[PDB]
Point group: C2
Chain length 193, copies 2
């Protein structure tokens, strides 16, 4: 296409990344050797559904007969082949559907997030999509209250940092602690205080 | 089939498809802008490509005698794909355009040089900060990372995700911003 993804990203091995699309456009299956998970290093078979690019590149897929929608890290993968073998996708499987029942994390258990964005970036708050299932509430002081139910507290905290002092983390406590700890860590190394 | 999760802005394919239509038809595209230097006027451009990231941006030439520029998608309205010839310049590369800044913002290009601590050297090696990056292994197991790019506001926002594993050795501006952001955020959130 005529689009390019700007910004930092993980490095690519398009050799292996070209092998996965070879079986979703043929509705076939794949198989690799994992380097993680509950079984350390076996070779395993899997039905492909999609890839999610992030600061870690994943691969949504179920194993063999039946399965569970879970995504394998492409860094901890070993030697795939486009099985000669068919494996059609579940019909109602949206790939965005995987991507929103958490955040830039997966399965880190879901939290009721409450943010207060001051006036200054209130209009910026309305425009911004923190999570699909979000609700923005105006307040009497022109600040706006942003609440949504999501995972990925760490990524969230990284993103809130870019809002600077326009955000006020109201809930949950794990997010406050997440942010403070991260600010203390970075603030020491770069000499902020 | 691979969209990126996280806080991606509310985007619209009704205009993303229309920009693709004007590009591959090699014809001009016009829209009115809900932003920019002029509040709400109809601009007419040669569309070149879109940038994906912190939001989505049309890269386009407006009128004749202009440099490439960027337009927030979510801020273009009432777009029409016209029948005038609008081929791209033969020299333009969208990739080279995007490479001129660490993020979206095109400002003074800086030789940035970072040091990543040994505990995260393996991650730095496997991480593409920028298209022009070189990494050199240092004696103590830490790694030096250098590249040329503008947009250090966005750079310092990313560096924060590296915790205390990253040291900014140049440019000075990137250092100052990083510290000022940390103080401000740290005061807002009660970290010190």
């Amino acid at each position: 296409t005529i689009a390019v993804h700007a910004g930092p990203r993980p490095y690519e091995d398009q050799a292996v990344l070209g092998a996965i699309r070879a079986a979703i456009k043929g509705l076939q299956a794949l198989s690799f050797r994992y380097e993680g998970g509950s079984t350390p290093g076996r070779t395993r078979e899997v039905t492909p559904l999609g890839v999610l690019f992030g600061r870690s590149n994943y691969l949504v897929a179920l194993e063999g007969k039946g399965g569970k929608p879970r995504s394998w890290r492409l860094d901890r993968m070993s030697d795939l082949k486009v099985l000669d073998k068919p494996a059609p996708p579940p019909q109602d499987f949206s790939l965005q559907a995987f991507a929103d029942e958490s955040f830039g994390i997966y399965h880190d258990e879901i939290q009721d997030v409450v943010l207060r964005i001051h006036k200054s970036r209130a209009e910026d708050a309305l425009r911004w999509r923190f999570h699909a299932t979000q609700q923005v509430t105006p307040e009497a002081d022109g600040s706006v209250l942003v609440t949504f139910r999501a995972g990925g507290m760490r990524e969230l905290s990284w993103h809130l940092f870019t809002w600077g002092d326009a955000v006020e983390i109201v809930a949950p406590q794990v997010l406050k602690d997440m942010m403070v700890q991260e600010l203390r860590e970075a603030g020491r190394a770069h000499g902020a205080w």
